[PDB]
Amino acid sequence: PIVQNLQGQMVHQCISPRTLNAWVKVVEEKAFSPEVIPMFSALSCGATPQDLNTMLNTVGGHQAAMQMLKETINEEAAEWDRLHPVHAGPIAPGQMREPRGSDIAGTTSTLQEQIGWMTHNPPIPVGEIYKRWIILGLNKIVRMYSPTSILDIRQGPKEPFRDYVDRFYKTLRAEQASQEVKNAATETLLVQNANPDCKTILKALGPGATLEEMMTACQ
Amino acid sequence: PIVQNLQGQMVHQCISPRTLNAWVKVVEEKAFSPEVIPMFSALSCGATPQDLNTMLNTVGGHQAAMQMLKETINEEAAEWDRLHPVHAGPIAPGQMREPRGSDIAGTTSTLQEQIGWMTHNPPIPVGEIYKRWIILGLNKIVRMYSPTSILDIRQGPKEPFRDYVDRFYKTLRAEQASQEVKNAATETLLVQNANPDCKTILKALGPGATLEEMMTACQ
Amino acid sequence: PIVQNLQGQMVHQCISPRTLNAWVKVVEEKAFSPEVIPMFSALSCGATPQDLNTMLNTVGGHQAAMQMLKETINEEAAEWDRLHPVHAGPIAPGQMREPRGSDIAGTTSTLQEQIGWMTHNPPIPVGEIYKRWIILGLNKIVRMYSPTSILDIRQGPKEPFRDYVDRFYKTLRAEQASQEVKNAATETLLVQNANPDCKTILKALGPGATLEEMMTACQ
Amino acid sequence: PIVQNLQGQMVHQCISPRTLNAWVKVVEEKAFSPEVIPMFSALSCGATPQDLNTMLNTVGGHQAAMQMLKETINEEAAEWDRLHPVHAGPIAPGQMREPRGSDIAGTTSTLQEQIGWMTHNPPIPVGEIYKRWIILGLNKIVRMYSPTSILDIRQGPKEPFRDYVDRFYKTLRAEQASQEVKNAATETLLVQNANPDCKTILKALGPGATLEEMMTACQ
Amino acid sequence: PIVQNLQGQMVHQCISPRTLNAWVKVVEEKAFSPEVIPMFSALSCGATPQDLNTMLNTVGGHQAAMQMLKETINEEAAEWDRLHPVHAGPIAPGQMREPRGSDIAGTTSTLQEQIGWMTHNPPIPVGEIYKRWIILGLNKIVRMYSPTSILDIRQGPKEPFRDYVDRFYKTLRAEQASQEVKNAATETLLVQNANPDCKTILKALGPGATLEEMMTACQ
Amino acid sequence: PIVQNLQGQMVHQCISPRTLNAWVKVVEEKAFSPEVIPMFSALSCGATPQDLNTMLNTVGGHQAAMQMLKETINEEAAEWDRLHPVHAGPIAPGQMREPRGSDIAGTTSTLQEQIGWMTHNPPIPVGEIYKRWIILGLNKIVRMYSPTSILDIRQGPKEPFRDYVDRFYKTLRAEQASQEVKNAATETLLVQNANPDCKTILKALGPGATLEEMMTACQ
Ligand SMILES: CCOC(=O)CN1C(=O)COc2ccccc21
Ligand SMILES: CCOC(=O)CN1C(=O)COc2ccccc21
Ligand SMILES: CCOC(=O)CN1C(=O)COc2ccccc21
Ligand SMILES: CCOC(=O)CN1C(=O)COc2ccccc21
Ligand SMILES: CCOC(=O)CN1C(=O)COc2ccccc21
Ligand SMILES: CCOC(=O)CN1C(=O)COc2ccccc21
């Protein structure tokens, strides 16, 4: 990554053994559960494109997902090149060349080039551009690997309302419902999918009930 | 987080793998037992709003609780906006814009904006404002998930008085009794709920007995 | 805590994940065995009152003990206020206000106030004052939770003298005998409580025998 | 390794216990699965040739592989010497001598010589030259130890298409197919090797189907 | 401990959680096996007397040994006071007072006094003086707790000579034989205590045989 | 060890708990397998003679090996004294005295003396001299403890050629064959010791076959 030292200048630091192991272990334990994505983003704080490729390449399983991710990255690289074409022909001596899509993705750029860009005044933030493409790709994989439709999450006859609600919002998160839909489902599908006794109590609460209010009512 | 370097200026540092893992593990092991809240506060020392969202988003279960927390955050954001409206229309060039509720909660502000605020002279402490809203939300969840009324904590016939007292104050803490109530319950409900033999001994101690005095008496 | 940086000025540092976990784990494994107290003191090196409250609040069980500790803290705070009353009425602008008992205990003082005091020239050592009150409280709890009188530690008929001595001094430590009593018990109760064969050998050694001498004699 | 200190000059630092243990453990757990190679590269960030030999020499098993690697290293050293012959006869006093192949591989050069080269202006990057030879060697070993031809990866009759795809691309990676072949196999051998029901569905999708499209189709 | 910072002045640093736990765990796993003593010395590198007392006080078992150690410490303190008596009567204002035995042992001196001494030019090395007394005490305990005389270590009839030699020198180390005795026992008691077949072979090797030579002979 | 600080001067640092534990654990798990020696060398990067003795003294078993090592060290110390005799009679005031063999081995020199030597301009590298003697000793122990002659490593009738080759080179490494012998054994004893089917195939490959070529042939 690039960090500020103890005196305030921006320099390269090697990726740590603790960071490398944290990422490999979270993929082993959680696969593509939705909370893996904010973990990746945090573990890659300050990352160069080289570091981002190291993190992805250290994963041993999930090679169908890693091939889908490559396909997303190539699509974003091709849209960058459409928006930001670069001059062909030789580099001005001692000067920096502009990055192409494959330079952002770390496949045709050196570590020194990447440092040059990220520490320019002002920075050309190649690590953050690439991280956004990767996270776009990862969210597609999360949605693909979500096993269950929200239509099929219904409260069991003896199931505590809290446990049902946990299943419901776990599923909405993996299915990638917008926050608007999440805030709205509370007056609709969450009630419809409740068991008969709780459905009666919720029906009588009326409209405008908060989630806290619904949870206390069916406690 | 924002920290002072080894030379004394306030700068951004990436959240550590050890901090990320500590928080995820404490939620896995303890859920919303009351001691999780002081742990969250300590683990988020110096946090930006970005860091606070990372901590909350890295939690994989408990999605009913995370939706209730969002609802609390939105309520506090809306009260901030009532108290501190911001000018509409374009930013003064090179200057800082004032934060709205959703800027405090990290949803409409960038990391650079958050650093600008927190390191202004004097600071606009957006990380500490947001942390207070989150902890307000978390304490509601603790109270909701408390399984047992203090009325139902009574000493068993062969139960050591110390073990009964531990159950009693564990329950008062989750039910969120004020410290006044905790200090007061010692002359009342703690005695009423004791077994017959200990109740007799405590009755005869009189009023004004400390907890230490009651514990020695029923030892 | 407050530490000296790499250049020698006294500044605040966040409490570490390793410190937080060390303390919670030692309470889980050892409860109020006497060696927990020197561990608390060491783990709280350089602590502010805020840090001391964090350590105590992160404990999940033992709520009878934590309520007794609050009672001790309130008693010491009330004696501080008797010895060191503070001026009522408004703060001198930009100047520091004197601490009251509840300011020392971190309940009515801010982190910034606590830093101001501890880094004044010369320091008003609010962290060390509070730590002394806490340790006074903790030693009472250790004595209360000691399960066995020294009168009831007697050597078994086939019990190795070394194992008996370990039981004896483990018990004296929890019962909070002074070092004078510990040094003295060697010529008295340690012999009286020995089994018949070892008691005979120790009787014949005479007075003035060291512990080493008694241990070799009954080996 | 060579690192920049907190003030920005390039200096030697000892290899850490955490780095040493990370590498030995990844070889114990994964052997020569393809993801071990990006792990080696990352763990050896900033390495001298001395450090690279330490990492390889700390491996206890896999001595057939370590002998094959020595053979690769000797071949690259001999090609370096063909391209870059060095002057025979005595060193200019106080000056640096040019590196031979065995100097790059750390067998005939001292640590001080290696530091001299790597920190020259501009650097003679002996650590990175050697690391490239080692990784060339390691990729040969990965290919040798790949147990299964891509021809023999076929979808079972009840095997989820995702699990089949994971097996397919895991195998292509160990067999060292180029990225062109990986991107191309999707319109060919991946379909041919599918079970009858999925093969029918994929045949009807037509040409140009992405991997994501094929995975959804056979879900 | 006292350490040199990153800029070269001698300052106090808090004892670490890793150091505290390392020591408690080595006593739990090894008790007073002889290799515990070099471990204590290393773990207490740079220690103040306060730190040395913390390490000893964090031990929970072995209270017969900790009482014997106190007795040794008191004997060394009393010999220091015989050699280095201190002036009675009031301290010169702002100046340092000379240490007594109980000041060295940390029982009547403050942390600030101990820092003053250890960082004086030239230092009065109170931490190293106390550590020597402690190690004197610890070596007595090791000798006391050694379970077996060297006379009773004899090679079994099918016991590999190497395993016998390991038992022999493990025992000599706990019994605290001088290095002269260890170097000498090789021509004597090591042969006498060997089984009949190996004794014959060793007898015929003659005098002056190294340990390596004896081990190869009976292999 | 001696390290360069963050500002570039050479100073003493205490040996770490992580280094101490790493070494003790590798001896517990691996004993004197050959890969323990490069691990010792790396873990002792920058070591003083004091640190080297700490590492060796913290080992609890293997006391026959530790006595053999002492014997090697004494032999190297005696050859140093033959090559580099020192002046008898008093030290020049404030100046440094020259090291004798037992000063190099840390038995008659202080820590301060060792630092003086290692940080002289130019250094008298007492830590590296001693480490070379120790490693000479350790390699003798590895050879002594090697359980099997290369003559007795022969391929089983159903044993995969790769597994046989791993056994063969594991044994050559412990027996301490030179690299010339290792490179040469491939055209000779490795073939002779192969099973009948593989021996036939290897015989027909001819001379000059690489190890890779032989491994593919018998795959
Ligand atoms: C413009 C092409 O960009 C890449 O293929 C970048 N990349 C790698 O280099 C290696 O690892 C990956 C794994 C998953 C997705 C992408 C990559
Ligand atoms: C004004 C809206 O503020 C949020 O929703 C902030 N927030 C997030 O961004 C993401 O994670 C959360 C989890 C639980 C509660 C709040 C959030
Ligand atoms: C003057 C009142 O001081 C306190 O109650 C300080 N205190 C806390 O704030 C919170 O945690 C505690 C736990 C056990 C004992 C005391 C406290
Ligand atoms: C020009 C000869 O270069 C080497 O043999 C370097 N080398 C070593 O020194 C020791 O460990 C190795 C293990 C596997 C491959 C190579 C090496
Ligand atoms: C002159 C008296 O010196 C001590 O008693 C020092 N001391 C302690 O303070 C506390 O812990 C110990 C444990 C074992 C031995 C000695 C001590
Ligand atoms: C000139 C004599 O040098 C030593 O005996 C150094 N030495 C020690 O001090 C203590 O530990 C050892 C263990 C194994 C071998 C040597 C040592």
Alpha carbon of F139 to ligand 4 centroid (Å): 18
Residue carrying the six token digits 């300052």: E11
The phi, psi pair for C192, rounded to 5°, reads: -60, -35
Contacts of C91 (CB under 8 A, 6+ apart): C97
Yes or no, beta carbons of A42 and B21 under 8 Å apart: no
Q: Looking at beta carbons, which residues of chain F come within 8 Å of E165?
A: 63-64, 67
Q: Is F195 an 8 Å CB contact of chain D?
A: no
Q: Which atom of ligand 6 is nearest to the CA of F72?
A: 15
Task: Say if residue A155 is in the same domain as residue A49.
Answer: no
According to DSSP, the β-strands at C2-4 and B10-12 are unpaired
Contacts of A178 (CB under 8 A, 6+ apart): none
Q: Which of F109, F132, F149 is the last residue of a domain?
A: F149
Question: Token digits for B210?
Answer: 């400390």
Task: Say if residue F163 is in the same domain as residue F61.
Answer: no
The phi, psi pair for B24, rounded to 5°, reads: -55, -40
Ligand 3 atom 2, closest CA: C74
Q: Which residue blocks in E84-210 are alpha helix, DSSP H?
A: 101-104, 111-119, 126-145, 161-175, 179-184, 189-192, 196-205
Q: How far is CA A93 from CA E50, E65, E84, E132, in A?
A: 63, 75, 75, 66
The phi, psi pair for A206, rounded to 5°, reads: 100, -170
Yes or no, beta carbons of A62 and D18 under 8 Å apart: no
Task: Give the total number of structural domains in chain C.
Answer: 2
Alpha carbon of F1 to ligand 2 centroid (Å): 49
Cα torsion angle, B207, B211, B212, B214, sign: positive
Q: Which of C99, C127, C149 is the last residue of a domain?
A: C149
Q: Map residue B2 onto helix, strand or coil.
A: strand
Q: Pick from F2, F6, F9, F14 the residue to mutate for testing the E interface (most E CBs within 10 Å).
A: F14
Q: How far apart are CA B83 and CA C140, in angstroms?
A: 49
Q: Is E42 an 8 Å CB contact of chain F?
A: yes
Q: Which residue blocks in chain F are alpha helix, DSSP H?
A: 17-30, 36-43, 49-57, 63-83, 101-104, 111-119, 126-145, 161-175, 179-184, 189-192, 196-205, 211-217
Yes or no, beta carbons of F45 and D9 under 8 Å apart: no
Task: Say if residue E21 is in the same domain as residue E114.
Answer: yes
The answer to whether the CB of E39 falls within 8 A of the CB of E26 is: yes
Alpha carbon of F44 to ligand 6 centroid (Å): 16
**Number of residues that make up chain A:** 219
Instruction: Please report how the helices F17-30 and F49-57 are oriented relative to each other, as an axis angle in degrees rounded to 10.
Output: 50
Bridge partners (DSSP) listed for residue C10: C4
Task: Say if residue A79 is in the same domain as residue A184.
Answer: no
Yes or no, beta carbons of B58 and A42 under 8 Å apart: yes
Q: Which helix (H) or strand (E) holds C76?
A: helix C63-83
Method by which this entry was solved: X-ray
Contacts of A152 (CB under 8 A, 6+ apart): none
Task: Say if residue A164 is in the same domain as residue A214.
Answer: yes
Annotate F2-55 with DSSP letters as a single string: EEE-TTS-EEE-PPPHHHHHHHHHHHHHHTT-TTHHHHHHHHTTT--HHHHHHH
Task: Say if residue A31 is in the same domain as residue A89.
Answer: yes
Chains that touch B (3 or more CB pairs under 8 A): A, C
Half-sphere exposure for C65 (CA within 13 Å, toward CB): 23
Q: How far apart are CA A142 and CA A174, in angstroms?
A: 6
Q: Which of C58, C20, C49, C35 is nearest to C132 (CA)?
A: C49
Task: Say if residue D140 is in the same domain as residue D154.
Answer: no
Range of the domain at F159: 150-219
Q: Is A6 an 8 Å CB contact of chain D?
A: yes
The phi, psi pair for B120, rounded to 5°, reads: -50, 155
Q: Is D111 an 8 Å CB contact of chain F?
A: no
Q: Pick from C9, C10, C11, C14 the residue to mutate for testing the B interface (most B CBs within 10 Å).
A: C14
The answer to whether the CB of A190 falls within 8 A of the CB of A205 is: no
Q: Which of F140, F64, F32, F141 is nearest to E159 (CA)?
A: F64
Q: Which ligand is nearest to the CA of E211?
A: 6
Task: Say if residue E133 is in the same domain as residue E183.
Answer: no
Q: Which ligand is nearest to the CA of D137?
A: 4
Task: Say if residue E2 is in the same domain as residue E98.
Answer: yes
Half-sphere exposure for A108 (CA within 13 Å, toward CB): 10
The phi, psi pair for D129, rounded to 5°, reads: -60, -50
Task: Say if residue F97 is in the same domain as residue F187.
Answer: no
Q: Which CATH number belongs to the domain containing residue B102 in this structure?
A: 1.10.375.10
Task: Say if residue F158 is in the same domain as residue F205.
Answer: yes
Q: How far apart are CA E174 and CA E189, in angstroms?
A: 17
**How close B21 gets to chain C, by Cα (Å)?**
10
Q: How far is CA A141 from CA A31, A49, A71, B179, in A?
A: 10, 21, 12, 49
Ligand 4 atom 8, closest CA: D53
One-letter amino acid for residue D90 of the chain: P
Question: Token digits for C18?
Answer: 């390793």
Q: Which ligand is nearest to the CA of A65?
A: 1
The answer to whether the CB of C211 falls within 8 A of the CB of E71 is: yes
Q: Which of C33, C26, C44, C1 is nearest to C138 (CA)?
A: C33
User: In which region does residue D106 sit, left (phi positive, over 0), alpha (psi from -120 to 50) or beta (all else)?
Assistant: left
- Dihedral, F182, F185, F187, F191 alpha carbons, nearest 10: -130
Would you tell me which residues 174-193 of chain F have a C-beta closer than 8 angstroms to some C-beta of chain D?
179, 182
Q: Which ligand is nearest to the CA of A58?
A: 1
Minimal Cα distance from F169: which residue of D? D63
Task: Say if residue C122 is in the same domain as residue C42.
Answer: yes
Chains that touch C (3 or more CB pairs under 8 A): B, E
**How close D64 gets to chain F, by Cα (Å)?**
5
Task: Say yes or no: CB of residue A33 within 6 Å of ligand 1.
Answer: no
Q: How far is CA D86 from CA D82, D101, D104, D108, in A?
A: 10, 10, 13, 14
Q: Which atom of ligand 3 is nearest to the CA of C101?
A: 1
Q: Which CATH number belongs to the domain containing residue D166 in this structure?
A: 1.10.1200.30
From E23, E59, E107, the mutation candidate for ligand 5 (largest count of ligand atoms within 8 A of CB) is: E107
Q: Looking at beta carbons, which residues of chain E come within 8 Å of C6?
A: 5-7
Yes or no, beta carbons of B215 and C144 under 8 Å apart: yes
The answer to whether the CB of C66 falls within 8 A of the CB of B169 is: yes
Q: How far apart are CA D147 and CA F206, in angstroms?
A: 26
Q: Which of E125, E149, E173 is the last residue of a domain?
A: E149
Yes or no, beta carbons of A20 and D43 under 8 Å apart: yes
Q: Which of D59, D54, D50 is nearest to D24 (CA)?
A: D59
Q: Map residue D96 onto helix, strand or coil.
A: coil
Q: Determine the Cα angle at F122 with ends F120 and F126, to 5°.
A: 65
**Number of residues that make up chain E:** 219
The answer to whether the CB of A6 falls within 8 A of the CB of B8 is: no
Contacts of D111 (CB under 8 A, 6+ apart): D12, D48, D50
